[PDB]
Amino acid sequence: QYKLSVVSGGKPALNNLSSVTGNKNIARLSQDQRNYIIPFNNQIKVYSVETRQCVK
Amino acid sequence: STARPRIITSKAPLLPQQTTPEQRYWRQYTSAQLVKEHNSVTHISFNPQHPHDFAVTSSTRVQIFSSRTRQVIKTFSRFKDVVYSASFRSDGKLLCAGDATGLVSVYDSYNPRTILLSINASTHPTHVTKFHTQDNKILATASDDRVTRLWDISNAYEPQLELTGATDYVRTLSFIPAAPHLVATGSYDGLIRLYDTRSSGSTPIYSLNHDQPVENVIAVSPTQIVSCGGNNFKVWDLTSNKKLYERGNFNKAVTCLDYVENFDSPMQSALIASSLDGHVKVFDPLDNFQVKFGWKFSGPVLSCAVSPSTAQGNRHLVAGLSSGLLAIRTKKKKSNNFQRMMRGSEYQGDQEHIIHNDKVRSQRRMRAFERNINQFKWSEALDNAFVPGMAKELTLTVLQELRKRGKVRVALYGRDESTLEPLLNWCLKGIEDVRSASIVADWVAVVLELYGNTLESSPVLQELMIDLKTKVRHEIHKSKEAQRIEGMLQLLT
Amino acid sequence: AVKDALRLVHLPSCSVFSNWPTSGTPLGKVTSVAFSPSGGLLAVGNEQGKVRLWKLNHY
Amino acid sequence: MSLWQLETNSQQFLPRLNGIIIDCQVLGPQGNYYSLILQMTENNSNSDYQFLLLNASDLTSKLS
Amino acid sequence: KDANASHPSHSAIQSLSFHPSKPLLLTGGYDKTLRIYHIDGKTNHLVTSLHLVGSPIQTCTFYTSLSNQNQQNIFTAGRRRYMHSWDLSLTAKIEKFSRLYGHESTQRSFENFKVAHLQNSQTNSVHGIVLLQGNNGWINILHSTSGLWLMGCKIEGVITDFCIDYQPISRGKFRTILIAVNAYGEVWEFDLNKNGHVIRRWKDQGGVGITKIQVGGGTTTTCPALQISKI
Amino acid sequence: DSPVLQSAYDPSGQYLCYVTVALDKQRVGVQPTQRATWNENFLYLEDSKLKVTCLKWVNDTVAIILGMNNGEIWLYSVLANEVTYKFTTGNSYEIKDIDLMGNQLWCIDSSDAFYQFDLLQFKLLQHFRINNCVQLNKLTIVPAGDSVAQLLVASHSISLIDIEEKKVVMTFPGHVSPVSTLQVITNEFFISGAEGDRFLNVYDIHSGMTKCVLVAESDIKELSHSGQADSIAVTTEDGSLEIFVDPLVSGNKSKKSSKKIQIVSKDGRKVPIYNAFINKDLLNVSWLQNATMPYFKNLQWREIPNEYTVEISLNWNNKNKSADRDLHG
Amino acid sequence: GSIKFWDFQFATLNQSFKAHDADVLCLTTDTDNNYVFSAGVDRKIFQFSQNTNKSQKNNRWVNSSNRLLHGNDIRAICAYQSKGAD
Amino acid sequence: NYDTDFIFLDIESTLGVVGTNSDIFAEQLHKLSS
RNA sequence: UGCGAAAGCAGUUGAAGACAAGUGGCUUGUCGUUCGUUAAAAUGGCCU
Description:
- The structure is cut from a larger assembly and holds 3 copies of chain A, 1 copy of chain B (493 residues), 2 copies of chain C, 1 copy of chain F (329 residues) and 1 copy of chain G (86 residues).
- Chain A is mostly beta strands.
- Chain A contains no helices and 4 strands.
- The radius of gyration of chain G is 13 Å and the shape is globular.
- The C-E interface holds C 31-37, 41, 43, 45-53, 55 and E 1-5, 8-21, 25, 27, 29, 37, 39, 41, 44, 222-224.
- The structure holds one RNA strand of 48 nucleotides.
- Chain D: It is found in: Nucleus, Nucleolus.
- Chain D: This is NET1-associated nuclear protein 1.
- Chain D: Involved in nucleolar processing of pre-18S ribosomal RNA. Required for optimal pre-ribosomal RNA transcription by RNA polymerase I together with a subset of U3 proteins required for transcription (t-UTPs).
């Protein structure tokens, strides 16, 4: 009756390349810059910069 | 980003006999006054109501002292023999004094010239006189007649009640603090009798056998009372007629007691006890009447008191000695046009919808070593350690912060003879203590590692190294003999 | 600095309006003033804590 | 994180950022946010990055 | 009707500004609160009211940008080393400007500020500047969103007041001029859409103790333009 | 006093149109009464002394007719933001009331004239005036389908009017003050209420006899009736709402209010209700949260108690808790 | 320690640099005024440059460089610049 | 965890668990006022 | 580096190629080069 799942997130996982200095931050702001779209190694998190919560 | 963490002062493991909160509070009773009386101070009472004056009964006079100047404001000298007891009424309006001729005389307080009435009690000396603590118009006087009397101060011709029954020398009364019909009296045969006054009154309802002749009986709760006499004091539950604590922490006989409640203190209650050998001690009724602080005086202490529960000002502990003197230890406590121009600066947002607050709190001022460690001036931080007016734990904590944080060597690089002598001259003093000596060891080791040539050149730190050598020789003899004592009681397990 | 010290000077003519403020205008000790961008409307704040409000009927 | 005023060569600092700055950049149209990647290298057994933008006005960590 | 008659002020009303578009009046004084009133004829009611503790305010201004005319900031400041900026959203998100980016010695109090518009002049991108009047002759101009110190203009004497003039150049380009007066009466005009460099220096005829300069007849900081072609 | 000068619901109570002053000029805005289905753009009256004297929702491009004070009925679509068509009479007299039945708009004038316009043709059909009706400030079309016979006009004294003969066919004893609400309840009754009194009276439109008197406990500002006469909710001068439940039954000649609703904040400040709307089992009340911005609330009015006190959350002394900072700063 | 550049006509400051830590005793320039060198009691020699075409068309000196060469002070500084000597 | 589940930590730190008219007017107004 | 206990106990430190300097070679030293082995320094320091 036991089942395995992965339920909680992981590391943010930026560009793990050499030979790229500066822009290794792949997270984006919106154009109506109210929510901040960051990838993770398990998902895309979309936080909201007004309330600091993850909204999607 | 955060704020910068403060430099934490190095605290070691605590040593035995630390400063308890009770003894910190009772140790700030200082600035002792010694007033030489004509004879032994036998009794001392406090005004209850504006609890700010106290009456001291010496021989053949009673002096009311003030609790803000500690001089005699008023004095009562028209007694014929030795006045024995002097207490204030519960309203603090008048003052009763029992006298060696068995003449209770009650004046009004703060007017020594109007003797209000002179109860002629027994022909024997009257040794204790106190008003009721609930009732106002009854006064209890016990005398060397082995009988106490309750007097209505309206009808001061015959006593309204005559509490007999004790075999020898009744020296103390007390009233029970919720039941006003209940008088506990104490005599020199032991045997705290206590009487219900609605009954006959010639027989106690029960008797508590303190084995020694009692000197005082006070009431702490409405239930428990404390009797002192002999080398101990005992406490008695009164609803169950039964003893439950006894402390015998004195050498000679406990002469007096009194008790404090609800006053501004870590101790919520306090019983202090005065004991004919010099000592007055304070016992805490909430942890099993354990002693918390004490004073030693210059002779046998005959009576003591403290300021009452609602003192609201300069607070006093007074002890009168059998030597004939009185010891007081106290703890103390632009234009209308311009204002109309600068009106609003005291408003603080009452009718206002949103109230914003981002004024940061102003923290404690940084010391020079802490701001130099912050500014990464590590040699200047060592220099700021070895100023003279620095605390020993502060020198230790800046040494430890430079040790953990960066480099002893960085802090010691640019030095020479004249700028190392503060460090080594402190290391002489720090090598004695246990808490410093590890840090002193590695700092001295590093400085002789990187200044071994200045050792050769300058002779005036060679002698400092030699003195340090004899210091470590004494300390290593001490740290060896401590291991020998450790083994010689490891043998005794 | 003093009470009721406010004038409205017409310009280009550079001539002070002589009918307002009168001796009974509750201007107070005029410590701020503001003009509306659209309504033609003065706000005058004084040291007592009062913004008084006037409308210029030309606008 | 220092920001150099390139006219007078004048630094403004932000000193205790719980990780070394391995990437920093201005972000807004007017440049009202700074986004930073903080590597947090007290543990050598893992590369654990903190993503921290912050508004450029009072330099407070909006959405770490 | 007296505009703050609905909700009384607990101090002398030190500054006062209307909104550029909405029917709002912002009052503020030394009782360290600032109040917005919906004004009309009859019933001037109180929209909202924010009490900044420990910060008496001396100048308070509605700023509204030229790009989208949708920000609606309120900048407020008194005799403090900071200046608050409330972002109007109808809780309240305010930020605090407290960093002169290397220039704190020449700006010990944020009392006399003015807010204005500035154009990048290589893009057609405008942004608001706040302009702080400092000690020596200094005007410290800094960004109204990021708070970055952009430039500084020093006049020679005791700076007493200043004002902002704008002049159009072409379609969609204008130029910002800072007009700052000595106590003695001599006036500097700085072009500041380029680096803050003087273009004109003249002298007031008469006038020895000079307290206040103002411009008018076009877009001042108190009659602000909502659209860049209306400058 | 309230900043909202005029306000009215659409039928079904889904939107609220409201005229408020904005720094000496009138502005007309529309708000949805429930967001779960801001609206920051207004119609601006460009003159400082032109103002709206009445307004009526038409029923389907949705629009408002705003009766002005210069002899004009502006017709203003709300999805767009322009007056689509400007009806005008031949005069400059302010117009006191309008109404419409279908496509047939009727209006009354300050010179006591009756005008008829056609919304389908944008034309002034009729202009007349009748004797002994000389201070008119309300009209109401008595509905008889697409026939728009029998106007019902008030001047402190209601008069029933046949429009084919242009004459008065009944005369109702009105009030001692000008009538402020005059509304048809059923096909045989109409309610009326005057300025500055707390008494409505329902008249029988076929006989002239007053059926009943309804007694608010404060002076009545607006009223709404549910579409089947079963409930009447009036809103008063002290910002309260009073619901008369089933007023047209046999408290026999004069009926008090059955329910009374007021709104207080969390503080103790009593905000006033202006202009509620009632329907079957559903009641939508309106107030102004900030100075001029309307907030709404739906209520199942049949299951609330009699003396109901709505509680709203409103900022009174709350510490500005910023989301980017903990409570210790 | 501050070094200021003043427009001669209009007699007013263009830009101020906070360069040295103590006094600036002596400062000099080259022929075409693309550089200004400066030195004082804090014993560093600072170089302020305007050599870029954008610097020359914008009249904007930059605090280019800084050298520590002297032991105690610099009380005198001068410059010579010719075809075989600079 | 203390309610009959077992949490585990992956080496790339994913925590896992082993357990047991008016309508168009409304639409166009929410468009045109946003 | 491995086993360990926080003590300690066993193991070390090759090769190729390229480049730089010095005097095509020779010497020395490097490597954002590879294979194998369990294997100190640019006056440059922390915000309001």
